[PDB]
Design a protein around this nucleic acid. Structure first.
Lengths: 271, 46
RNA sequence: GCUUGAGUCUCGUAGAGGGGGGUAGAAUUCCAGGUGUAGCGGUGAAAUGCGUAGAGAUCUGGAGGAAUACCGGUGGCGAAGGCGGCCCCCUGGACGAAGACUGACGCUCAGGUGCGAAAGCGUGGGGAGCAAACAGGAUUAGAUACCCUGGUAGUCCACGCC
RNA sequence: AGGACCGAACCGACUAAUGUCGAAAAAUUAGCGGAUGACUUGUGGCUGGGGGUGAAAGGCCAAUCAAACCGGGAGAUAGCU
RNA sequence: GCUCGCCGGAAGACCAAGGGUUCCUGUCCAACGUUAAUCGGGGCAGGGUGAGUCGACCCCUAAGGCGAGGCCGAAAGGCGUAGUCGAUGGGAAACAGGUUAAUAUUCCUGUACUUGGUGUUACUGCGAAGGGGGGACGGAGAAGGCUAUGUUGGCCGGGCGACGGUUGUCCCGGUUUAAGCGUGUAGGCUGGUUUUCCAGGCAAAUCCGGAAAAUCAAGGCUGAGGCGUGAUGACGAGGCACUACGGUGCUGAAGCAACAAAUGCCCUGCUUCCAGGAAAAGCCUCUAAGCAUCAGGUAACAUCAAAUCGUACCCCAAACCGACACAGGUGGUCAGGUAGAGAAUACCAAGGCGCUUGAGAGAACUCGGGUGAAGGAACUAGGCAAAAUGGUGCCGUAACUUCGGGAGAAGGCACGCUGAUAUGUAGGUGAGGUCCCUCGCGGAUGGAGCUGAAAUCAGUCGAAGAUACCAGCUGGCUGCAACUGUUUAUUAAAAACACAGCACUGUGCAAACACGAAAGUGGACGUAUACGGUGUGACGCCUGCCCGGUGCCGGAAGGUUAAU
RNA sequence: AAUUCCUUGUCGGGUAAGUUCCGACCUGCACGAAUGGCGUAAUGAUGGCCAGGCUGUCUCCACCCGAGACUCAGUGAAAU
RNA sequence: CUUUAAUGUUUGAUGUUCUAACGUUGACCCGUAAUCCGGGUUGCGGACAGUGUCUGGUGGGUAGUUUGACUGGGGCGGUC
RNA sequence: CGCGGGGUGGAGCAGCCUGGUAGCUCGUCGGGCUCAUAACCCGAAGGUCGUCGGUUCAAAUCCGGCCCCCGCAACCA
């Protein structure tokens, strides 16, 4: 749930937390953990490729089951644990035979709800099944792009794709950006919509809030010198140029849709 | 103030060491010049 | 004490009363393709606009949001504002029937509390149609009006406020 | 609980005096700012010259930066002294 | 040597780093020391660094590096898999005392511990580059139980004291003791045990995990400190004995209690919140391919081995970094008494020092400061500098506001000492006695001793009771910026930048973008509630009109249109 | 006005006296709605102004305490 | 010569389908305990994609340079 | 000081460029419509083209002096 803090300290007067009481208050299942040493926005050659990335709090990487290859085996969700790497709540379920795994928790998922994957599951949120079994009009998430890839679509907080039609082999998914995508019916998809939908209201309130998250300050081009950015220069706030990126490419409305092989899958672009 | 040189022999041998030189091609050119010029103190050592 | 005030219980009645969760058909707009061809829309008249890049007309399919034709009536319900396509669940009020029970428990009611169309406001979605403001075209002595083509907010949904 | 308050160590460097061939190739003294945070610091690695890095001053990259140092073109050229 | 003066959370005592004999002794004085110098971190010669338990080496990982093949690139070379390196991290084991001119947890005395080889005896199935457990982990906050340590008292020893008093409530010094072993507490964590079964753990599994039951209620893991023991031992103040007169030899009483109490230990705890907090090995355990009169493993005992390297000295500085014996800079640990909230500060203990030019003079003038009649910013660019306010408890506190603040607003009152309430109260700790017991480090009860605020009343001293150091100037109006923060290291700290928020826009993931000739990576082991770029910069009320120029987006019928 | 050249614009307050400051008038040389506009509690080693307090800043400097300066002995530079 | 119908023939421009080039930063197995990579199965796309050569376009992201003289100092104006 | 543009019936603006011919709207006058005004409909008049001079077949126009108005510039220490 969403709650607003009391304006005691300057920088607390705008802080809004997304408090959730059902989050497990302990350490996760160790055998599904491995370090996630930060990159700092640096490549193999050490150069800084993506800027604004550095610092932040040290977090351990959890292992999430996106593929769901364990078929015909019931599972019982034990606790909705928190994950630092994503914006969605994860659920540590336990299979009927005795194996524990993490999966992205949907919206309507309480402690103890029975879920199972496979090609013959019942229509219930959390269940995974290939799209040629899902009813037309239903809504799913964690959609597997290529058969066996694992899952690429709708994986963040409150994210969900809508199955529109089934063109025989290909099934038409109206994506989250309002874009019509084509994908094969062989791919699996998990029913329901991803939980923790209050992420949109979680305002950071203060400057340091972005720092421990990993975000680094962004310096505008209007402040820099002409030698450091295409913009900048002048004796007192003089933009006067057509807005561009640090490398000359004109931003603010320039399409970079260049893959060309995936044009056969886009039915309607994001309008 | 802190004059620009606060030594630590480990980092010294990691940057100007014999093997730190011999490991690369450019380093091999250096010692070629150092031996040709006949300098006794080729690298930093003890 | 009593009972003709009031209230409660037993059996039923009619209903857009309210809240929550689903579904259906018509139409409009847009998109896609085919058929096919020079005007379409609009008005007192005309024009801006759309259209030979192939519209409108027409057939099939699909995506959508919103309102519920005929039934419908100075008909019905609730204290009022107000509320109607249908289905399920929860739930309120009023009235009739033949009796019993408690025995004036009552009527109103400053301050106070609650509910309270539309518009408007904050946060998050949605956005067909309609449509503040706005622009253009006319009318006009002038038209920042009435008329016409578009058209943002809003109108719709959830949680609060006024 | 707090980028909370007063205030040492620690870090920083606003005012003035002294200093300016200084004790010191930016320090001292008397007062200052932050001090549970975007804090500070040790050890060890990574990013390099039209490149690096930058809470962006054209600042910093070994007392040198609107383009570092070393060596080679090279005894560059100089209508100038 | 006797006084004086200074630091004393340092100017003290120890390490890492970094230097490299600067350490110690004898001797010498030209050169070095900003002066002299029989002195010295200077010259010469000699001596000194002793480890199974400290640290490195070694076993094992992080960032990251090198990299068989391999991919890729004119060549050089780049990246990277198996691996192998790489601590500032994790992993076995020692403490007290004595001794030297200089070294000692290293040598000696005493008492212990750990990892393995070999062999003997008694038993038993062992065995992986494979699995599981463990190792294994965040910030902050408060509490409880202790210790280091300190004070007092008792006791022991010495003194009874060069100007008045001091056999007494007097004075001074001392009152030290570990590792290990046993006991296994305060406290913390967790329901144990047995039988059956199973698509789980790349194969297997008796171990882990899960799913059904039975029986009983506790068992177990972990744990500072205390008490014994170590220890009729060492040490120990002061005497007794020889002086090369530096010190050595010998001897040696008391050695307990109470209270106060840490940021140290239990605590690598518990609670709470969020930004959700290494890896692998050693260790334990289960088995595979196999090997089974074996080999190995467990326990006990005997014996052997524990190698190589550093170890001196300095280490907030005359030895490191600054050309210097340079007012600067340098990470970690221990850190006492009184006053005090305190590691501030003042004066001292331990210990270490007076800074390597001095002696007179007491002019101008310069710097570091004190005081200053009357006036009180008239100074001046300007209250810059100085001055002044300054602590604690309580009283009292505006405009305005985002209802948190503003605020410690402003402005006031009492502050010493003595006695009394009380031969030191409320409170804290807490022995002896009494009782019980699932008998130990127990619980109730009990209250001596120890210890000690603060409030009130009364009396008294000075001009002044926060008397020193220490320790806010306050308020009114208003511009800019929200606020903390960052920046021109070495003239600019700000109104500049950052900032959460908001918007636009690009990107459907082999994503955009970016480094890169390429491969490959970052983005992200994330995926539209996400990521990149641009702009403005909390919040409140809002954010108007224009598509001519330019850029950008969409659609292509026509004209023009390169190569071919 | 961080913007107004002209200009010390005009009026009012503040002062014995106000080219700066505060509140208005609009004659906006040449403000203006994300190169954001207008306000805004709190904050600021920030800009300007005012009052109180307190003082050697000053009217007008006087005395005194120390480190140099001066003299003697030793060592012994520098820019030019 | 023009309008033109059928056949043969010649190539160009599109549409649809297929699998063998190729892609495969999809799944599985082996080399091999290895998420690089190679080979082999299978699925999905598909003569696209991508690369090379020639070529038109955009292009201060980037590089090498130009940016006159006279002038009662230069600039501006004027002139040559 | 200099450079560019402009001065057209009563007013605001075309036309000049590349010379012979002056147009648009409002306003004005007269009539009509209405009871009267406006608006509206019909008809018509009105321009030394700032001033002077030169050049030309011909000057609103080309060139030059002058007056007025508008804009820029009037800068570097």
């Amino acid at each position: 749930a969403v709650v607003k803090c009391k304006p005691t300290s300057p920088g607390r007067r705008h802080v809004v937390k997304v408090v959730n009481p059902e989050l497990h208050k302990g350490k996760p299942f160790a055998p599904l953990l491995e370090k996630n040493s930060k990159s700092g926005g640096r490549n193999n050659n050490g150069r800084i490729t993506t800027r604004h990335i550095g610092g932040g709090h040290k977090q351990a990487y959890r292992i999430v089951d996106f593929k769901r290859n364990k078929d015909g085996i019931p599972a019982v969700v034990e606790r909705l644990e928190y994950d630092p790497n994503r914006s969605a709540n994860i659920a540590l379920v336990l299979y009927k035979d005795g194996e524990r795994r993490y999966i992205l928790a949907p919206k309507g998922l309480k402690a103890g709800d029975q879920i199972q994957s496979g090609v013959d599951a019942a229509i219930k949120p959390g269940n995974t099944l290939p799209m040629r079994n899902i009813p037309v009009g239903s809504t799913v998430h964690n959609v597997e792009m290529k058969p066996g890839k694992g899952g690429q679509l709708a994986r963040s907080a409150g994210t969900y794709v809508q199955i529109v039609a089934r063109d025989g082999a290909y099934v038409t998914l109206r994506l989250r950006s309002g874009e019509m995508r084509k994908v094969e019916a062989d791919c699996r998809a998990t029913l329901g919509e991803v939980g923790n939908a209050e992420h949109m209201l979680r305002v950071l309130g203060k400057a340091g809030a972005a720092r421990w998250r990993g975000v680094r300050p962004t310096v505008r081009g209007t402040a820099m010198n002409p030698v450091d950015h295409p913009h900048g220069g002048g004796e007192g706030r003089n933009f006067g140029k057509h807005p561009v990126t640090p490398w000359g490419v004109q931003t603010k409305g320039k399409k970079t849709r260049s893959n060309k092989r995936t044009d056969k899958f886009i039915v309607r672009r994001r309008s | 103030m802190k004059r620009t040189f606060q030594p630590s022999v480990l980092k010294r041998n990691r940057s100007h060491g014999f093997r730190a030189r011999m490991a690369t091609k450019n380093g091999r050119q250096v010692l070629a010049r150092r031996r040709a010029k006949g300098r006794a103190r080729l690298t930093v050592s003890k």
